[PDB]
Ligand SMILES: O=C(O)/C=C/C(=O)O
């Protein structure tokens with residue numbers, strides 16, 4: 001369903017065009033409209049977004065601006081009921097080009113960079129305590145990593161370890177606090193959009209070291225294989241991604257020439273992408289999540 005009373009919107013927070021952005025905007029698939037909402041307190045690109053208990057969280061990132069460039073350890077929370085951002089406890093370390101996933105109401109922050117450091121560390125946020133705690137680190141240092149959750153397991157996909165862009169991927173098993181490699185993708189991808197739909201982890205787009213990608217592949221956890229699906233209409237890296245009522249939406253990114261405003265929607269029943277709207281301005285490195293309409 002789409003309940004609150006209210007529908008669910010696709011929120012895009014932050015991003016990058018010439019400098020890091022503070023925009024918070026919300027798209028409504030049911031009518032095509034965009035709403036501009038309360039700016040982030042600090043501009044940030046390379047952040048991740050997620051939702052827990054109806055609240056939107058913005059995690060990590062970096063503020064690229066002429067004043068200077070500052071990697072972010074911030075966790076900030078947006079309440080659609082109040083149109084207000086509130087600071088939460090900060091992470092143990094700044095994490096630019098972070099990946100995030102939610103299990104059992106807990107936020108996992110994965111990887112990312114801090115200056116020339118590439119993290120394998122992972123930490124977990126408990127909103128009921130407003131506390132972060134480190135957990136087992138990944139087997140691999142990963143920035144520009146895509147993260148998704150399927151069947152209460154956390155997956156970290158692709159990225160960049162400081163020297164090589166990665167096709168590798170790994171899975172975190174919470175009850176054993178353990179990471180294990182899974183089958184690698186068929187394509188090297190950093191800055192891909194990663195999400196979950198039905199029983200598959202999707203990895204769309206990204207950068208393979210030479211080109212921005214339009215190819216899309218998905219990992220069936222039952223068969224442990226990756227297979228390509230229809231490619232997106234636009235090549236893009238540093239895209240935002242989310243799932244809304246059974247379809248995948250990809251937002252913006254960089255195609256090697258333009259910071260895209262294109263939003264594309266994947267229908268898995270027909271294996272086709274369509275353009276569904278344009279963001280109000282081209283940008284990359286956004287955080288995206290889905291929650292109730294604001295007030
Ligand atoms: O500064 C950035 O966030 C990246 C820009 C790009 O991909 O060209």
Ligand SMILES: O=C(O)/C=C/C(=O)O
Pocket residue numbers: 051052053054055104105106
């Ligand atoms: O896990 C929760 O508390 C709810 C998350 C959501 O709003 O989807």
Ligand SMILES: O=C(O)/C=C/C(=O)O
Pocket residue numbers: 144159160165190191192206207209237238
């Ligand atoms: O591999 C990188 O460093 C960047 C990838 C991207 O543009 O998202």
